[PDB]
Amino acid sequence: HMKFTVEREHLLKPLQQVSGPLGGRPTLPILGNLLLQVADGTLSLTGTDLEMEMVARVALVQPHEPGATTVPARKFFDICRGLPEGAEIAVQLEGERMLVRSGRSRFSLSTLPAADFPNLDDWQSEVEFTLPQATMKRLIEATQFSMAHQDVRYYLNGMLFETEGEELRTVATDGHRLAVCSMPIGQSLPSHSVIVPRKGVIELMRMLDGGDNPLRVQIGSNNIRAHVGDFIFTSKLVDGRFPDYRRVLPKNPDKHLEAGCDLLKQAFARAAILSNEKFRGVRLYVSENQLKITANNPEQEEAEEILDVTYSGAEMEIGFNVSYVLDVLNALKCENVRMMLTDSVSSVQIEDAASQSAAYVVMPMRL
């Protein structure tokens, strides 16, 4: 019985957005559809994968009839997108098919009942706060690469969202590296730490432009919610014990190296060429104001990079996974970096020499 008529232009960004949590080969067919709900004067598009959901509300000016149904996401989007610019899309449910008409174009999509669509369990918020899109973007961007992908340690396959005082902190680690970023959000916050799943973190970052619209976050008992404009992202939290970043940070490195972020990044990128394809091992030789990067591969090929650094401390040698090091140098979009070395078998803390908002810890490899 549901019906609505809205401009193609309006329906495009919402369709692309709610078609976010939808992946590949969904076991349950209804996870490939989008829940369309016409109710008071707003059309609600919902897209889920059972663990997270994305709701987009679209204002309806034209006459419409209340109701709800689910329709295939790719087909419905590609249809709206394929229509000419400024098209009037008249959608009406007719039996077990949804009729999409726009000019001399007519489409009949197969629908699944709205009652069968998954609803994320109703819950109560505990921590609630607002911050700019740019702040959340920076917080996620600077730590997302360090998350574990498919580790048996389920709690590492995601990002920690910890609120401590004035700041919001994001921590991500995979057992080899650490990345921590904390920024003030002009608010008195309670100490609360939650693990947002890997996939949820990606879809959360994908709904942020730059700084365009404030982001209202609601952290509950086992869920997190993010309201930016007419979009409501909700995700279950990875219920586990995330490791303490403070224990991972080197307690006392005695050897501090300072160098140009870009010069250091290129030296590692060039050395990585003749490094082992699988292990990606490179040697660091820290001498007085000089760093030597050496890479070897099974084919007996060598790279050697010598760089002028600001080094103060004893001479030591440390092995590293050049990909883990380059990941940090690329995350640090800055002019100069600082490396805090302890010894050949301990972690090095790499961070921006100007700002300490973000810090990275990389575990070395056997020489």
């Binding site: 080899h176 292990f279 056997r366």
Partner: peptide, 6 residues
Amino acid sequence: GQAXLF
């Protein structure tokens, strides 16, 4: 190799 961070 690689050393465990924890």
